[PDB]
Design a binder for this molecule. Structure first.
Ligand SMILES: *[C@@H]1O[C@H](CO)[C@@H](O)[C@H](O)[C@H]1NC(C)=O
Length: 92
């Protein structure tokens, strides 16, 4: 019935408050938070129709080459059934 989404960041960059704040105030979002660059968006309930999420991540450390970070999505009840999906940076 319920679910949670994790997002590990590449090298070292975080987002701003008017983009993190704007996520909790939308359909299916319980809490938006970041635990040591793991940008977790706490989803409310699971649904068949597609739901899109978005925000701006500001580049701090410009020492870059080619590393795509991970995305996780496991339900709040049974954490064994999830789906991985690595995303690459816009420059890499
Ligand atoms: C989701 O999909 C199933 C069929 O795949 C459907 O029976 C159901 O009504 C849909 N919605 C919910 C809330 O389960």
């Amino acid at each position: 019935n319920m679910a949670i989404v994790d997002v590990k960041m590449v090298s070292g960059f975080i987002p701003l408050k008017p983009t993190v704040k704007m996520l909790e105030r939308s359909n299916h979002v319980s809490r938006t938070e970041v635990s040591s660059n793991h940008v977790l968006i706490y989803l409310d309930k699971v649904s068949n129709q597609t739901l899109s999420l978005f925000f701006t991540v500001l580049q701090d450390v410009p020492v870059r080459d080619l590393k795509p970070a991970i995305v996780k999505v496991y339900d709040y009840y049974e954490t064994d059934e999830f789906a991985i999906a690595e995303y690459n940076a816009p420059c890499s």
